[PDB]
Design an enzyme around this catalytic site. Structure first.
Site, PDB file in Angstrom:
ATOM      1  N   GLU A  70       0.883  -1.150   0.000  1.00 36.32           N
ATOM      2  CA  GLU A  70       0.000   0.000   0.000  1.00 36.32           C
ATOM      3  C   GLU A  70       0.926   1.206   0.000  1.00 36.32           C
ATOM      4  O   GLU A  70       1.656   1.443   0.969  1.00 36.32           O
ATOM      5  CB  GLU A  70      -0.869   0.032   1.256  1.00 36.32           C
ATOM      6  N   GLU A  95      -8.173  10.592   4.496  1.00 32.54           N
ATOM      7  CA  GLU A  95      -8.283   9.666   5.609  1.00 32.54           C
ATOM      8  C   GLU A  95      -8.797  10.520   6.749  1.00 32.54           C
ATOM      9  O   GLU A  95      -8.142  11.480   7.155  1.00 32.54           O
ATOM     10  CB  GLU A  95      -6.926   9.077   5.971  1.00 32.54           C
TER      11      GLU A  95
END
Ligand SMILES: OC[C@H]1O[C@@H](O[C@H]2[C@H](O)[C@@H](O)[C@H](O[C@H]3[C@H](O)[C@@H](O)[C@H](O)O[C@@H]3CO)O[C@@H]2CO)[C@H](O)[C@@H](O)[C@@H]1O
Length: 226
Positions: free
Chosen positions: A123, A206
Site C-alpha cells: 500500500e 483519511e
C-alpha cells in the site's frame, strides 16, 4: 450533483474512467459527500467522525480495481515491471479543523484478483496535506527527493507493505505527478516487488475526526505500459 451518505456508497464518474466511494470503512459515524458525476469532484458535506487514533473513513476517487470493483478500461491490474509511466493530477481544498489527511492510496499485490484485498502486497500512500497532528503508520525510514518534491518515507511491515510518502511541506495540488518515481523508490527499498501488480490509484481523505469542508477535484490518472 448527487449526495452519497451510505457507508459503502459509490458512483462511477468521468464516463466510467473513475469511481467515487464514500468508503466509511472504520466507523459507524455519519458521513456524506456531494459528487459531481462528470468530473468525480466531491466535497465532504458531512462527517460526524471522532474515531480517536483509528481511521474512521477514506472517502475517495480511484482508477483501477478497488477490492474487485474495477473502473472502465483502466488497463489494470498490470505488473509493476511492465509499467513505463504512471501519472496523476489532483486539486484538494484543505480545512483548518479536524484530524485528517489528503493523500493518495495505491494498492499492489502478487495476484490479479483483488476481491479479497491485497494481502502480501503493498500500500503506497502519498500525503499532500493534513491537520490535527495525524501521522503515517509505521516509522520514518528516510527522506528522499522524488518527482519534484521532498518526501518523508514511512514504512510499516503489516499483512502487506505499508509505504507512505509525506511531503516535507504541504501542498494543495499536483499536476502530472510522476507516480512511477515513487513506485521505483519503493521497489529499490524492497517494499514492492517488480512482479507484483498495480491494482488501483486512489486519492481522498483519511478521516480520524471531522472532515466536513474538504474537497477533491481535477482527478486524473494515466498508465502507460512498456
Ligand atoms: O469496500 C470493500 C472492502 O473495503 C474494506 O475496507 C478497506 C477500505 O476500502 C480501504 O480504503 C482501507 O484502506 C486503508 C488501509 O487499510 C490502511 O492501512 C491505510 O492506512 O489507510 C487506507 C485508507 O484509509 O482499508 C480498509 C480495510 O483494509 C473492508 O475492510 C472490506 O470489508 C470491504 O469488503
Amino acid at each position: 450533483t448527487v449526495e452519497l451518505c451510505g457507508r459503502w456508497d459509490a458512483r462511477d464518474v468521468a464516463g466510467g474512467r473513475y469511481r467515487v466511494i464514500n468508503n466509511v470503512w472504520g466507523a459507524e459515524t455519519a458521513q456524506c459527500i456531494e459528487v459531481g458525476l462528470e468530473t468525480g469532484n466531491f466535497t465532504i458535506t458531512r462527517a460526524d467522525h471522532d474515531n480517536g487514533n483509528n481511521v474512521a473513513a477514506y472517502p475517495a476517487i480511484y482508477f483501477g480495481c478497488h477490492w474487485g470493483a474495477c473502473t472502465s478500461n483502466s488497463g489494470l491490474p498490470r505488473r509493476v515491471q511492465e509499467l513505463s509511466d504512471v501519472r496523476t493530477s489532483w486539486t484538494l481544498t484543505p480545512i483548518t479543523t479536524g484530524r485528517w489527511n489528503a493523500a493518495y492510496d495505491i494498492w499492489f499485490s502478487p495476484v490479479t484478483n483483488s476481491g479479497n484485498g491485497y494481502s502480501g502486497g503493498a500500500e503506497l500512500m502519498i500525503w499532500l496535506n493534513w491537520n490535527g497532528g495525524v501521522m503515517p503508520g509505521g516509522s520514518r525510514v528516510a527522506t528522499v527527493e522524488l518527482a519534484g518534491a521532498t518526501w518523508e518515507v514511512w514504512y510499516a511491515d503489516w499483512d502487506w507493505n505499508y509505504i507512505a510518502y509525506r511531503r516535507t511541506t504541504p501542498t494543495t495540488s499536483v499536476s502530472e505527478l510522476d507516480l512511477k518515481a515513487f513506485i521505483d523508490d519503493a521497489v529499490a527499498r524492497g517494499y514492492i516487488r517488480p512482479e507484483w501488480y498495480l491494482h488501483a490509484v486512489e486519492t481522498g481523505f483519511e478521516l480520524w475526526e471531522g472532515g466536513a469542508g474538504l474537497r477533491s477535484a481535477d482527478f486524473s490518472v494515466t498508465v502507460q505500459k512498456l
